Structure formats: structure tokens, C-alpha cells
Amino acid sequence: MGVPSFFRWLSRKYPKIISPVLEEQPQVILPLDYSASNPNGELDNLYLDMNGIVHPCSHPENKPPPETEDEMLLAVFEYTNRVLNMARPRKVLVMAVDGVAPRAKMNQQRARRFRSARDAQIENEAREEIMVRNKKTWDSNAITPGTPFMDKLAAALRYWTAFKLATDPGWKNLQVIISDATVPGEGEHKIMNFIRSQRADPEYNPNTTHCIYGLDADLIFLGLATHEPHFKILREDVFAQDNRKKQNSEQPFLWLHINVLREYLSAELWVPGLPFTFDLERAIDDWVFMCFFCGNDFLPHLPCLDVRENSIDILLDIWKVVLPKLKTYMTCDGVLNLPSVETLLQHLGSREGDIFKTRHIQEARKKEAFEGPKNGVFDTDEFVKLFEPGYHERYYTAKFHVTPQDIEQLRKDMVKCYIEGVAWVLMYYYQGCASWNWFYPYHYAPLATDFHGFSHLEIKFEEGTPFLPYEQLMSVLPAASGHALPKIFRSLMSEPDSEIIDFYPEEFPIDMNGKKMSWQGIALLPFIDQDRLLTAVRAQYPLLSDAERARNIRGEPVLLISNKNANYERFSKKLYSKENNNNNVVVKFQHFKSGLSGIVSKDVEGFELNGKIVCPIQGGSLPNLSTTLILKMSYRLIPLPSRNKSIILNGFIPSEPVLTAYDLDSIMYKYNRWNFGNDLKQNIVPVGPKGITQYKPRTGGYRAFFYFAELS
Amino acid sequence: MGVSANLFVKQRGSTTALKQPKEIGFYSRTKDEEYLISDDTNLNYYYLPDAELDRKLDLSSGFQKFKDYYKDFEDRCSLRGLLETIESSERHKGKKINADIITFRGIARKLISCAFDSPSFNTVDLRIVSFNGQLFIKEVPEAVNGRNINQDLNVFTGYKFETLATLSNPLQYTPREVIEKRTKRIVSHGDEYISVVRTGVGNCKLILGAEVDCIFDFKENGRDNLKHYAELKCTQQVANISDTHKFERKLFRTWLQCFLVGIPRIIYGFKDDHYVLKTVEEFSTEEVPVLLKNNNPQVGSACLEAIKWYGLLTEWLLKMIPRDEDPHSQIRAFKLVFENNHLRLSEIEESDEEYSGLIDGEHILSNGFKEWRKSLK
Amino acid sequence: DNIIPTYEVGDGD
Ligand SMILES: [Mg+2]
């Protein structure tokens, strides 16, 4: 396979963001977490998006996958150990695993879990046709919250953290936080809530350097959305994945510097002659909003905005024309200005017809240059012909099977729900989820010419509780993966008598859109009625074993682990050498003393100061006995005192600027090449604060006078 | 019969260090002259991003709506809040603070700068002194009851820069609308937060009241915040070699002001002609003597001369024989201090004088409730 | 002249 089109867009548009990871290759068993980081500068903080490494380990590109769940965990330890030797956090490590997700994502997860369960039947039929007899593939639907496998990873992680904190003297004041699958919310959302809560402590150091490990493209926009400028993203080298045309031991990696992406956006987002003052922190929020509007987990794309990269470039050309007519930027701290969004989408609606003509002409050129239903694959687009007049009626009547008198009443409701969804997704990433229950009720988006008559709208939400793990599993698994549930719920999935069979159809129609000759179609599964699902599932609970009522509680505690640390005496004295045999009292702590803030209480897993720790996997590892070396505790975030602000904090010192004047001018004026798999090795960039002062030298200042005189 | 004495202003002593400053307590003064001891409603927090210096912020804007409360006060230079703060720190430990002189940092700086600045350039004032078992020193107000409006606009410019660069609450607890309203906000004077600092030079032990602008990074509750404060200072252009020397003389007086009370950061704004804020720069109080020794040796030399004179001055305030009779019910004595023609002059206020009956018997220097605190031992 | 102003440790009372 070639480079993903999103990474071809970054290497073309912003080449100096990207630089190689440097490794020391010592061959001795490497002690030196404590030596100076070769890949420039130290990290204070690292965040691991754990599903980004559980998936590569259990379904690798290497011909052998691991043959047991024990060998899968052993491979995850090998990979995370390699990640920390590149990233070397000095102060904090967060291990965030996906928990129970909002309804907004559960209906998108359900599609992929149903779809992949049919692909597993097609390959098992191919293995049965060849028939090592009965060697079935391991079901990847096991890597979800509440399964026996995540309950196994939860123990493996907490052991491997203790092994490092007990045995490695580089970790002697690293703080490790573990936000396992038993804690609700996806890893990407857990990490943003962590960064946002640390940043709200008055004692926070404005110059802490940060990093996220992960394979998702959305991490770039989430790195920007923090407004921490000292930020880098760690990823496997997708340009080497092309140039390899022989083992993971020599797989190279990349840093993406958000520090330098802000430097490009400072020229790219400039608009002259605005009536309000230009402000880069608000301009970047509007750009991050456009990157989530036209490519999203929670909503279908507009038909017009089919490819995310050139779609961002189209919306930005509209925003540059609209912006001088507006009263303000379109976004503020994660809240939309709907009047301004209505004018942006009206401008897109005026282009939409010519976007369809040009797409169909380009596909005709691609062709000549080379030269609903109850079940099965089909395609709704062949009737619509968006490149030919009158498509508006033809689109709605084909997608929804609706008569032409009801199209208005349908259009008003979809535009309401889609804008409520766009408002939900912006709030999700900027302040944390507004509702766990909200979802978009339809398989398709409106056309861009439909987006009007919502400027007046007032948007409101309630934080209803997230689902319990079995309510989550029932809400996203096909009947084929029922083995991951207790025996009792498998009847509800599969007996024709069940009150909820209609949520679990063995086959469903799949609608290929845009004539996409691939796997990319929409699975038209029925939307779950959650009051009807929950009343069926919660009726089984008095028939579960107590060992099965565990795994179905909320992990309200996250967990922290420390080792003879700067806070170890204070924590041990208040938490464990107690006044009475209870778990009543709690310790609140602040960023200055150790580089982390939070609220801490005695562990609920049954940890004690003179006990034994022993691993759950058969890979030949120490029973550390090390509760004398280590402390672990239940951990909780300090709740925000106020809404988080998209601003730079007091005392932020920038790094050295990387872009030369020609890099800025060639961006302002769009001046269109790198052999990027080779030319990338010329990039190296400094990390952390440069100098000791918050301000640039400028003419008309005492210290600046001697600076410009000496520079002359 | 009573004391008369003169000190020559160019004679200098041997002391070259201060005893490390420590915060006794604090108070805030309201626009109504009410003093709020152990209360910090008037402590500001610094916030001014580098991007704000690209915007042409105007330091003259709002001059016509300036709330100068300080003019209307009945006792502008009163010791009342300083004495009342000291009492509150003594009550919970049952004994006097061991210190020899109680005063304001402004009076200490006005004394020390006599060694360098002539009476007009210094803006010399009457200072007035009494004993109870220690010296209490008070400034006499200005008696007012580059020319005219163009001087008042250069005064206002300092209070507006302190209003543009700060917040009334931590940045983390301030809503975004309060940051946006900040250029329109009314500017005011006589609404201070004052820290009370224990310090000393040579063998003299001193308590200084010190007005502070803001806290730069963060606040610690129930602790010395002295390492977290900053001074934000009045603004000018620098565009030519002789402008650097006009600045260096202001930077010396600003170092002297911070050094006496242990404030570690100095922040300077700079202006065009008209009133546009052109740039901001920041200095650690430890840099300044080295920076002056490098750039202007004959100004950087004055940093030691100031302390060698400050020690001589304070020793001769005790050795020019005011009574330090310790029993807090023994009879008091009361004195003037002046600077005049390279001499500093001191004389007792004999009982025939209009001042003498009122500083001895009444409210004009020490509060009646403070005299009761200390005469109750 | 290498001498410059500095603070000294207080009496500890
Ligand atoms: Mg000031």
C-alpha cells in the first residue's frame, strides 16, 4: 500500500512539521531511561492512547499473529517498552484505554463490529474449504470494555507499571496514571480531559513539554485544541511503509511538531482588513472546527465534502471570503456562533453544484486515462446523478424512499439534528461530552444548499450517566460475538422469542455511496431503542453471579502508582498509616511539588504496604514483592473551576522559530517537490523553551536597543 | 536642652548586605480609607501575552474618567494599617516584634536617594518621627490642595499600564469576557494592596510597609508570597544612545525599590511619542547591578554606595540619641527630619509647637488602639 | 571591583 492521502497532504503542505525519531541502539540490557534524550529535548509528560498499540500487536502486518491472549499481552509489553525508550517522560505517564463510549459513537462502533463479524465468516468458510484443523481466527470484537480480555489487560498494565517503578532507577520520580477500560470515555477524550485539568491548576508550569502516542489522524487537531504550544505527536513512519517496497525491531518513527504547525497556520490563516482584531488562538479554533466539520466519527460527511484534505482547503477559502463580513470568529472556547456558521454554509451551498460537476469530470478523466433492498450490497447513487440538474429532489427520494411532498419537513429535521451534532462534537473535544445519550438519527447528511433557517436555534444537553459495561456490550456486538458476554445475555441476542431480536439481524443491507469500488459502504443497521434495550438487559441482573456483577460496575477511580517519590511520605502517612480501619479521608495535591496535580485516596483493589505483587502472564517475570518500594492509590482529577479558555498562559516562552521568511511568504501566496522519504532526515528542530523571557526584542526597548545594535 | 543633630549626605559607612526580607503580614486599603488587615482583595495577578504588543494599545485612553481617590483622603500617608497589621501578628504570639524602626518603603527610598539626587530632583519632603520603645517614621503629605496636564497624563500612563497588564483574580478563575473588557475598564489610584516586610541593614532591624502591584506566577495561602510578587513600572521610548542613560537612572531607582523588600521581578513597558505601548521587557532584581556595571559603570557603582549609606543613616538615627526607653508607659519624644544643602537636619518638637501636643497626645502618628495594645504589654 | 549587593541569613527568631 502507498502513503495515506492525509499524510501526502501534510508532507506537501507543511513539510517542516515532521522529523525522524533518533534511537541509541546500544548492543547490555539498557538501564538508561536516565540519560539525556537523543530525539531533541526532554518530555515532561507522555500520553498513551492504548488501543493504538493493542490493535497493531494482535493483528500485525507480519504473517504470524500472536497465537494466545497471553502472547498478545507479552507483545504489548515489548511495544510499550520501545515507545518509552524513544519518548522518555521525566514526570508523568498516562495509560488511557477506551472505556464505554457515548451513544454518538456506539452507533458507528456497532456498524464496524457487525461488518467485521461477517468478514470472519467468509474467511472461516475459506479455511473450512481448505480443511491445523479447526484453527479459527481470534475475534477482534474481544477488544471492547467489559470483556474477559480487557479485564486481563487491566491486570497486565498494573503489573508492568509496578515492575518498572520497582526495578528501574530512572523511574524514581515518574508518576504513572492508569485509566483502564473500566473507566468510561474513549482514550482520546480521557487524555484531553487530563491535559485540560492539569492546565487549570494555578501552580502549573506553562512550559511543560507534552506528547501523545497514537495512529489516529485526529490527534493533530487535538494537539492544536489544547493550546499547549510545546506539543509533539509520536507515530510510525508511513513514508518508510512505502519505501520498504525486515522486522518491527527496525521500524522507524516520526515526530509531528504542533509547535511548528502553529507557525505555518500563522501565515496560512492570516486575513487582512478584518473589522475585529486578528487573534491566532481563535483563528486556530475555527480551523480545527472546519477539520472536524468535514471529517468526523459521529456524523456522516456532506455529499459535497467527500475527501477531508481538499475539503479543508475549500472551507478555508470560503472562511477567508466570509470572515471580514462577520462580527467575530465562528467559535469561542468550544461554543458555535450559529449566525456565522449559517453564512459559511450558504457560501458552500452556492459552490456545491460545480463541485459535483468537477468531481464527475475528474472521475471520467481517471477512467479514460486508465482505459431500500432487504439484504446484500447495493448502491443508491446510480439514480441520483448529482452532476446533472434537479438532483436535490432525486437525492432525498432515493436515500430516504420519501414522496416529494414530505421533503421539506424531513430537511428541517435533518439540518436541526446535524447542527446539534456539529455543536455536540465541538463541545466534546473542547470541554468534554455534553450528553452520553445524544445521537444523529439518520444514515445520511443534508445537501449543502439545505443549511439555512437555523441561525435562531438554542442548543442544550444533559449529562445522563454512561452505560454499564454489559449494556454497552449488548449495544455494539453482533450475535456471532456473544461468547464475550455471560451465558444469560446470549439468549436475548439469538432466540426468535427474545424481546429485542430486531436489533441483531444476521444480515443487513449495505449501501455503497459515491460508487466507491471498495469496503467503504454504509451498513444500514436499525437504530437501537435504548429504553427498550435497557429494560430487557437490566431484567437479567438478579440472575448474574457475583463474579459477573464485578466487571459491570463503573471504575469511578482512575489509578496512580508512585515509588519512594517526592510525595511518597505525605501520601503513605495520610492514606495507609490510618486513624481508623476505613477509607474515608483523601489527599488533594498541586503541580509544583512533583509535576502533577489531582485527588488521591486508598486503593480499592486491596493493595497494602507489605503485600506481594505477582504477574498474570506466563512470560517468565518476577513476583516483585515490592509493595515496600511502591505506592498505588485511587486517583481522581481536580474538577475545573471555570470553562477552559483557548488562550496562551502567562509565562509561556516559545522555542526557536523554524520557518524562514520564504516559508511564510510561499504559504501566504500559495506558491507551488520533496523526495520526502529521504529529504525528511534533513529536519531537526529544537524542543522546549528558548531563552528566559516571555517577549521578543522590538525597537523602542532598553534591552532590545543593544540586541539590534549588536545584530547590525 | 533637647536633641539637635546634622548628618553630611556624602559621608558613607561599611555595610554591603541586608538581612533576608520576610513577610510579617499584609493589608488592603479601600477607596473609603478603610484598612482590611489580613485581606487581599486588592492583590492583582499578572497577564499580558506577547501578541498584545503587536496591537497598538493606547496608554492615554480613558484619562478623563480616571478615579484618583488618593487626593481626597484625610491622612494620605497614615501609619494606621501598618501598626494595626503588626498588632495582629503580635496578638497570636504574646510579645513585641523585635525591630528598631517601623516605616514605609517609600520613606526608606526617599532617605537613601538623598545620597545621589538634589532636593528638587529628589522631591524632598518633611519626615516626622516619634518613639514609644522603637522609632516610628511618617512622611508629611505634599501640601498640594512635563508641565500641567502633560505631567498628569504621564502620571496616569503608569496606572493604566498596571490596569492593562493585570487581572483582579487568577487567570484560571477569570471568565473570557473580563479579559476582553480590560481596555475599556476604569483606572483608579488609592486602592492598594500593602505587604508588611521585616528586614534590616547592619545591626538595625526594620519593618517596612510596601505597596505591591501584582503576583506574577501564583499565590501560596498562609505563607510568605514575597518571591511571587513583581513591580510593573512607568514607561518611555528608547531610540538613541542618550535615551539608554535616561533609562539607566530610572532602572537604578527601581532596583533600589525592589531590593529593600525582596521583590524578585521588575517589568517595564516602553512608549512611542503620543501614548502607544511599543514593547515590554522584564528584569530579575539580581541582574540589575551587573547590567548597570556592564553598560554604565558610574551608575552601577551606586548599588553599593546606597547600602553603605543606608547602614550609616540608620545607625545615626539610633546614635543621634532619640530615647529608646523601653517601658511603654514612660514619656514620649518627637522630632523633625529634613534634607537641606547636602546635610540632613533633625530637631525635637518642643511642647510650644502646634505639632507637639497632637503627635504626643493624639491620632496624628500612632493609633490609640495600638498605644493600648503595647501599653497592655 | 567584583563586589555587589547580597542578602544575609536572618537571626532565626
Ligand atoms: Mg508598579
3-state secondary structure A608-670: CCCCCCCCCCCCCCCCCCCCCCCEEEEEECCCCCCCCCCCCCCCCCCCCCCCCHHHHHHHHCC
Crossing angle, helix A150-167 and helix A69-87, to 10 degrees? Answer: 40
For B146, residues 6+ apart whose C-beta sits below 8 A from its C-beta are: B154
Distance CA B224, CA B226 (A): 5
Extract long-range pairs of B89-94: CB within 8 Å, 24+ residues apart. Answer: B89/B24, B89/B25, B89/B196, B90/B373, B91/B373
Q: Which of residues 230-259 of B touch A (CB under 8 A)?
A: 237-239, 243-244, 247, 251
With CA atoms as reference, the chain A residue closest to B265 would be A693
SS3 sequence of A366-432: HHHHHCCCCCCEECCHHHCCCCCCCHHHHHHHHHHCCCCCCHHHHHHHHHHHHHHHHHHHHHHHHHC
- For B201-230, b/e burial (b = at least 16 CB within 10 A) is bbebbbbbbbebbbbbbbeeeeeebbbbbb
Judged by CB atoms closer than 8 Å, whether chains meet at A700 and B238 is answered as yes
Cell numbers describing residue A120:
470472519
Q: Which structural technique was applied?
A: cryo-EM
**Residue B128: strand, helix, or coil:** strand
Contact indicator for B83, B102 with CB cutoff of 8 Å:
yes
Contact indicator for A96, A195 with CB cutoff of 8 Å:
no
Judged by CB atoms closer than 8 Å, whether chains meet at A279 and B51 is answered as yes
Contact indicator for A255, A220 with CB cutoff of 8 Å:
no
With CA atoms as reference, the chain A residue closest to B272 would be A700
B and A: touch, per 3+ CB pairs < 8 A?
yes
Distance CA A435, CA A437 (A): 5
**Is B172 assigned a ligand-binding role in the annotation?**
no
For A573, residues 6+ apart whose C-beta sits below 8 A from its C-beta are: none
Q: Which of A620, A688, A612 lies closest to A652, judged by CA? A: A688
Judged by CB atoms closer than 8 Å, whether chains meet at C3 and B16 is answered as yes
Q: Tally A–B CB contacts below 8 A.
A: 89
Domain count, chain B: 1
Q: For residues A270, A271, A272 and A274, what is the CA-based torsion angle, rounded to 10 degrees?
A: -130
With CA atoms as reference, the chain C residue closest to B300 would be C4
CA angle B363, B365, B370 (to 5 degrees): 70
Q: Which of A185, A679, A691 lies closest to A432, judged by CA? A: A185
Per the domain annotation, does A347 fall within a domain?
yes
Distance CA B113, CA B354 (A): 30
H or E element at residue A175: strand A175-179
Contact indicator for A561, A627 with CB cutoff of 8 Å:
no
For A274, residues 6+ apart whose C-beta sits below 8 A from its C-beta are: A323, A324
Cell numbers describing residue A291:
477539520
Q: Which of B35, B59, B62 lies closest to B192, judged by CA? A: B35
In sequence order, what are the beta bridge partners of A412?
Answer: none
Contact indicator for B235, B277 with CB cutoff of 8 Å:
yes
CA angle A523, A529, A534 (to 5 degrees): 120
Q: Which of A502, A471, A506 lies closest to A485, judged by CA? A: A471
Distance CA B86, CA B97 (A): 8
Q: Which of residues 178-207 of B touch C (CB under 8 A)?
A: 200
Per the domain annotation, does A352 fall within a domain?
yes
Task: Quickly list DSSP for C1-13.
Answer: -----EEE-----
Q: Which of A448, A140, A439 lies closest to A318, judged by CA? A: A448
Distance CA B248, CA B258 (A): 15
Task: Calculate how far, in angstroms, residue B299's C-alpha sits from the geometric centre of ligand 1.
Answer: 22
Least CB-CB distance to C5: which of B21, B98, B307?
B307
Identify residue A11 by its one-letter amino acid code. Answer: S
Distance CA A274, CA A662 (A): 24
Q: Which residue has the cell 473551576?
A: A641
Cell numbers describing residue A413:
429535521
Q: In what order do the strands lie in the sheet with B277-284?
A: B166-167, B44-46, B214-215, B229-233, B265-271, B277-284
Judged by CB atoms closer than 8 Å, whether chains meet at C10 and B200 is answered as yes
Q: Which of A210, A196, A255, A197 lies closest to A89, judged by CA? A: A210
Per the domain annotation, does A293 fall within a domain?
yes
**Is B298 assigned a ligand-binding role in the annotation?**
no
Domain of B132, in residue numbers: 4-375
Contacts of A592 in chain B (CB under 8 A): 218
Distance CA A616, CA A152 (A): 8
Contact indicator for A93, A46 with CB cutoff of 8 Å:
yes
Distance CA A610, CA A653 (A): 45
- Which letter does DSSP use for residue A563 in this model? S
What are the backbone dihedrals phi and psi of residue A293, each rounded to the nearest 5 degrees, phi first? -65, -45
H or E element at residue A189: helix A187-198
With CA atoms as reference, the chain B residue closest to C10 would be B19
Per the domain annotation, does A704 fall within a domain?
no
**Residue A249: strand, helix, or coil:** helix
H or E element at residue A359: helix A338-370
Contact indicator for B226, B22 with CB cutoff of 8 Å:
yes
Judged by CB atoms closer than 8 Å, whether chains meet at B304 and C7 is answered as no
Judged by CB atoms closer than 8 Å, whether chains meet at B281 and A651 is answered as no
Measured on CA atoms in the order A38, A40, A46, A51, is the torsion positive or negative? negative
Contact indicator for B270, B278 with CB cutoff of 8 Å:
yes
Distance CA B89, CA A58 (A): 67
- For B24-38, b/e burial (b = at least 16 CB within 10 A) is bbbbbbeeebebebe
Cα–Cα distance list, A281 to A269, A354, A423, A645 (Å): 11, 33, 19, 10
Contact indicator for B326, B133 with CB cutoff of 8 Å:
yes
What is the DSSP pairing of strand A210-213 with strand A231-236?
Answer: parallel
Strands (E), chain B: 4-8, 17-29, 35-37, 44-46, 67-68, 101-104, 127-131, 135-139, 166-167, 188-189, 193-201, 204-211, 214-215, 229-233, 265-271, 277-284, 334-340, 343-348
For residue A637, count other CB atoms closer than 10 A to its CB. 17
Q: Which of A15, A120, A105, A131 lies closest to A466, judged by CA? A: A105
In sequence order, what are the beta bridge partners of B5?
Answer: B346
Contact indicator for A21, A255 with CB cutoff of 8 Å:
yes
Q: Which residue has the cell 496591537?
A: B55
Judged by CB atoms closer than 8 Å, whether chains meet at B16 and C6 is answered as yes
From B163's Cα to the closest Cα of chain A, the distance in A is 16
Distance CA C8, CA B255 (A): 18
With CA atoms as reference, the chain C residue closest to B98 would be C13
Task: Calculate how far, in angstroms, residue B162's C-alpha sits from the geometric centre of ligand 1.
Answer: 6
Distance CA A193, CA A599 (A): 15
List the single best residue of C2, C3, C4, C9 to mutate versus B (max B Cβ within 10 A). Answer: C4
Cell numbers describing residue A422:
456539529
Q: Which residue has the cell 496560512?
A: A268
With contact defined as 3+ CB pairs under 8 Å, the chains touching C are B
**Residue B111: strand, helix, or coil:** helix
Q: Which of B97, B89, B357, B78 lies closest to B206, judged by CA? A: B97
Burial (CB < 10 A; 0-12, 13-18, 19+), residue A304, is buried
Q: Tally B–C CB contacts below 8 A.
A: 36
Contact indicator for A652, B217 with CB cutoff of 8 Å:
no
Task: Quickly list DSSP for A496-520.
Answer: TT-TTGGG--S---EE--TT--SS-
- Which letter does DSSP use for residue A527 in this model? P
Contact indicator for A199, A229 with CB cutoff of 8 Å:
no
Domain count, chain A: 1
H or E element at residue A233: strand A231-236
Q: For residues B361, B365, B368 and B372, what is the CA-based torsion angle, rounded to 10 degrees?
A: -100
**Residue A251: strand, helix, or coil:** coil
H or E element at residue A20: strand A18-20
**Is B213 assigned a ligand-binding role in the annotation?**
yes
From C12's Cα to the closest Cα of chain B, the distance in A is 11
Burial (CB < 10 A; 0-12, 13-18, 19+), residue B345, is middle
Domain of A427, in residue numbers: 269-450
Distance CA B281, CA B53 (A): 11
Burial (CB < 10 A; 0-12, 13-18, 19+), residue A479, is middle
From B131's Cα to the closest Cα of chain A, the distance in A is 44
Burial (CB < 10 A; 0-12, 13-18, 19+), residue B331, is exposed
Distance CA B334, CA B300 (A): 37
Judged by CB atoms closer than 8 Å, whether chains meet at C8 and B17 is answered as yes
From A700's Cα to the closest Cα of chain B, the distance in A is 5
**Is B273 assigned a ligand-binding role in the annotation?**
no
Judged by CB atoms closer than 8 Å, whether chains meet at B51 and A280 is answered as yes
Contacts of C7 in chain B (CB under 8 A): 17-21, 262
With CA atoms as reference, the chain C residue closest to B262 would be C7
Q: Which of C9, B270, B139 lies closest to A700, judged by CA? A: B270
Residue A560 CA from chain centroid, whole number: 22
Distance CA A234, CA A21 (A): 9
Contact indicator for B105, B210 with CB cutoff of 8 Å:
yes
Crossing angle, helix A407-431 and helix A103-130, to 10 degrees? Answer: 90
Q: Which of A106, A159, A111 lies closest to A523, judged by CA? A: A111
Q: Which of B374, B366, B324 lies closest to B133, judged by CA? A: B324
Cell numbers describing residue A268:
496560512
- Which letter does DSSP use for residue B29 in this model? E
H or E element at residue A234: strand A231-236
**Is B257 assigned a ligand-binding role in the annotation?**
yes
Distance CA A288, CA A426 (A): 9
Q: Which residue has the cell 456483577?
A: A549
In sequence order, what are the beta bridge partners of B130?
Answer: B136, B334
Per the domain annotation, does A378 fall within a domain?
yes
With contact defined as 3+ CB pairs under 8 Å, the chains touching B are A, C
Distance CA A228, CA A225 (A): 8
Contacts of C10 in chain B (CB under 8 A): 19-20, 22, 200
Identify residue A616 by its one-letter amino acid code. Answer: P
With CA atoms as reference, the chain C residue closest to B20 would be C7
Resolution limit, Å: 2.7
**Residue A54: strand, helix, or coil:** helix
What are the backbone dihedrals phi and psi of residue B271, each rounded to the nearest 5 degrees, phi first? -120, 150
If phi over 0 gives left and psi between -120 and 50 gives alpha, with beta otherwise, what is residue B101? beta
Distance CA A296, CA A218 (A): 9
Distance CA B76, CA A516 (A): 82
User: Is B19 near chain C, with CB under 8 Å?
Assistant: yes
CA angle A686, A689, A690 (to 5 degrees): 70
Least CB-CB distance to B282: which of A203, A694, A705?
A694
Contact indicator for A313, A679 with CB cutoff of 8 Å:
no
- Which letter does DSSP use for residue A276 in this model? S
Cα–Cα distance list, A8 to A4, A213, A677, C5 (Å): 7, 20, 11, 60
Contacts of B59 in chain A (CB under 8 A): none
Cell numbers describing residue A23:
534511537
For B237, residues 6+ apart whose C-beta sits below 8 A from its C-beta are: A700, B243, B270, B271, B272, B273, B278
- Residue spans of alpha helices (H) in B22-140: 80-91, 105-112, 119-122
Cα–Cα distance list, B65 to A264, B60, B147, B185, B276 (Å): 43, 11, 20, 10, 19
For A416, residues 6+ apart whose C-beta sits below 8 A from its C-beta are: A454, A457
Contacts of A705 in chain B (CB under 8 A): 238-239, 243-244
Per the domain annotation, does A342 fall within a domain?
yes
Per the domain annotation, does A605 fall within a domain?
no
What are the backbone dihedrals phi and psi of residue B46, each rounded to the nearest 5 degrees, phi first? -75, 140
A and C: touch, per 3+ CB pairs < 8 A?
no
Identify residue B20 by its one-letter amino acid code. Answer: Q
From B293's Cα to the closest Cα of chain C, the distance in A is 9
- Which letter does DSSP use for residue B187 in this model? P
Contact indicator for B108, B137 with CB cutoff of 8 Å:
no
Cell numbers describing residue A678:
529521504
Q: Which of A565, A567, A560 lies closest to A629, judged by CA? A: A565
Identify residue A212 by its one-letter amino acid code. Answer: I
